[PDB]
Amino acid sequence: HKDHNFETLVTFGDSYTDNGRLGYYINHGGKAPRPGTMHDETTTTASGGLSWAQFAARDAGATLMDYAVSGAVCSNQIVSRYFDLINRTFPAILDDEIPSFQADVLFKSLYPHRTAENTVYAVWIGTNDLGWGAFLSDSQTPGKTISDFVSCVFSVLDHVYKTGGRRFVILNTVPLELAPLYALPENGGTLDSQYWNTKTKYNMTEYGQKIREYSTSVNTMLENGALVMASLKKRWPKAMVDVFDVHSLFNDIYNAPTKYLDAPHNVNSYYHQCGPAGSPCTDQPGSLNGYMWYDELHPSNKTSSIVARNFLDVVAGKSKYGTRFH
Ligand SMILES: *[C@@H]1O[C@H](CO)[C@@H](O[C@@H]2O[C@H](CO)[C@@H](O)[C@H](O)[C@H]2NC(C)=O)[C@H](O)[C@H]1NC(C)=O
Ligand SMILES: *[C@@H]1O[C@H](CO)[C@@H](O)[C@H](O)[C@H]1NC(C)=O
Ligand SMILES: *[C@@H]1O[C@H](CO)[C@@H](O)[C@H](O)[C@H]1NC(C)=O
Ligand SMILES: [K+]
């Protein structure tokens, strides 16, 4: 615990990170928690267990403030999706998560001693922005591009910086073409999915290559844009900005699953298999620790634990997956 040089982990993102906040919106009339209150934490997330942020905070002996909301995009002004269950859009980072955090930091009951040195701020967003019903189906605000998505991520860091945060980690986009949702059926991919219930009406090869181009392009722009902003444009004076190349880590797990997963070392299918309505559902035999993917879109709790251990290495300034900018 004392081997990790922070006391508080603040996370922004989507269902890869969420530890109960969409559940709050669902159960409280589609409204965020009141300022100075957090949602109830769950230990059963979209991973089938803990999210990476929970593994990381537990191993660091850190308090987790997890503002991630399942379904989120970076900015609803760029692209949004309607969640009928809450009678509004899925919450987004700029529109919903950041305003919550900005209100909460004024409460000592939540943030007893938040300093530039003792708090790490992480953002992991893009899975929904780049995917079906968003940029992949050209559903964004007309004229917006994936370059505007990258600009939004840096705007998240501006808002954190403005509150006095200085230690930033951007987690880049995963290889979404390897998620069974976007993979070809011949390689374990879904047919019609709860996340894309018309997938089989499309050239699945073309859409999977398009999401590879979008994700790799965003990853190039996140790393070199962060370098420009941090090192040339003076955008975050005296901040430390890490980029965690979780894209390479996902490829490493996918390509060598016997090094990372328990039997059956499955990377191309998914543990929890639902019909295209999202119901009914069957779990595969054997351990969840033997699956890269809890479902066709979400990394397993086992994959999430691997993300967490590498994240802590990135925060320590000693990781093959970390690039640090002062
Ligand atoms: C991921 O979550 C699964 C499911 O909860 C965990 O696996 C089980 O762990 C318990 C405690 O060891 C066992 O008794 C069960 O037999 C397992 N399966 C079920 C259905 O409960 C797994 O340990 C978690 N992995 C990580 C890395 O946290
Ligand atoms: C959405 O609106 C319906 C009907 O107006 C209502 O019954 C329901 O409680 C709303 N959902 C949320 C989470 O507010
Ligand atoms: C589907 O997309 C792939 C990848 O671009 C292409 O090679 C193939 O010709 C396409 N098939 C059809 C029927 O359009
Ligand atoms: K610590």
Side-chain angles (χ1 to χ4, degrees):
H1 287 178
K2 308 222 156 68
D3 295 347
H4 304 285
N5 69 339
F6 62 98
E7 297 186 48
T8 308
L9 179 57
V10 180
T11 63
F12 304 93
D14 58 31
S15 59
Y16 283 23
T17 305
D18 174 302
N19 65 348
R21 201 166 183 95
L22 181 70
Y24 186 97
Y25 280 87
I26 291 172
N27 289 114
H28 298 84
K31 301 302 184 206
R34 291 312 125 84
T37 76
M38 290 291 283
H39 62 280
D40 298 331
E41 182 167 28
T42 181
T43 58
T44 308
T45 76
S47 74
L50 301 192
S51 74
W52 76 272
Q54 293 176 298
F55 285 111
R58 174 178 79 185
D59 288 337
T63 297
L64 177 57
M65 308 297 279
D66 186 348
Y67 290 92
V69 181
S70 295
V73 293
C74 192
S75 174
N76 282 332
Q77 298 294 108
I78 299 303
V79 62
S80 69
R81 305 185 296 157
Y82 196 88
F83 184 31
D84 297 279
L85 192 60
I86 64 170
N87 305 307
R88 59 151 294 178
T89 53
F90 288 105
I93 301 185
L94 285 187
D95 304 77
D96 298 289
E97 305 180 15
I98 279 291
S100 287
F101 164 72
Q102 288 170 323
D104 283 346
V105 292
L106 307 175
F107 287 81
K108 294 291 177 204
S109 61
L110 281 190
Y111 291 95
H113 185 49
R114 181 184 68 108
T115 72
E117 303 79 16
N118 72 13
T119 304
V120 174
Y121 305 85
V123 52
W124 198 12
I125 198 72
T127 292
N128 300 315
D129 311 59
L130 295 188
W132 177 255
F135 275 98
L136 203 70
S137 51
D138 302 311
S139 301
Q140 77 272 23
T141 293
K144 296 300 184 180
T145 65
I146 62 175
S147 297
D148 297 311
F149 165 79
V150 174
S151 298
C152 179
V153 173
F154 303 147
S155 184
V156 174
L157 295 186
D158 289 347
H159 285 280
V160 176
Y161 187 88
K162 247 81 159 194
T163 74
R166 296 293 185 267
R167 297 178 65 183
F168 308 149
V169 186
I170 300 170
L171 286 81
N172 70 2
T173 67
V174 304
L176 288 161
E177 78 279 10
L178 301 184
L181 175 59
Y182 297 112
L184 292 180
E186 71 202 61
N187 182 37
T190 71
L191 302 179
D192 297 332
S193 170
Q194 71 181 316
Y195 302 118
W196 186 9
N197 72 349
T198 54
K199 179 175 177 191
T200 63
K201 308 223 178 265
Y202 293 95
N203 182 343
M204 293 175 270
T205 303
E206 191 263 354
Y207 276 80
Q209 289 302 295
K210 188 171 80 182
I211 209 169
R212 173 171 171 73
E213 290 291 355
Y214 288 4
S215 57
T216 60
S217 300
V218 154
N219 293 347
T220 300
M221 287 186 285
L222 282 168
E223 185 185 332
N224 294 297
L227 175 55
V228 165
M229 295 310 160
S231 305
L232 251 32
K233 292 227 152 73
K234 308 323 164 169
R235 182 166 182 165
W236 305 300
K238 302 176 78 143
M240 194 178 293
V241 191
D242 291 304
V243 180
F244 177 17
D245 184 12
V246 66
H247 188 275
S248 294
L249 173 59
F250 268 58
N251 278 331
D252 288 346
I253 296 167
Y254 192 96
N255 290 328
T258 67
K259 283 193 209 163
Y260 296 99
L261 304 175
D262 301 332
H265 314 288
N266 185 274
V267 298
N268 78 347
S269 193
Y270 50 100
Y271 179 78
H272 181 73
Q273 302 194 352
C274 300
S279 186
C281 298
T282 79
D283 293 340
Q284 291 284 275
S287 176
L288 222 201
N289 288 332
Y291 288 82
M292 183 166 182
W293 307 100
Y294 175 72
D295 70 22
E296 59 260 59
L297 193 49
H298 292 88
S300 65
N301 64 333
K302 181 60 171 179
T303 302
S304 302
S305 72
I306 298 160
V307 171
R309 54 184 209 222
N310 284 282
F311 171 85
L312 291 177
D313 289 344
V314 169
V315 170
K318 197 181 171 234
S319 182
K320 65 171 160 196
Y321 304 109
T323 312
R324 180 160 282 186
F325 311 125
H326 303 287

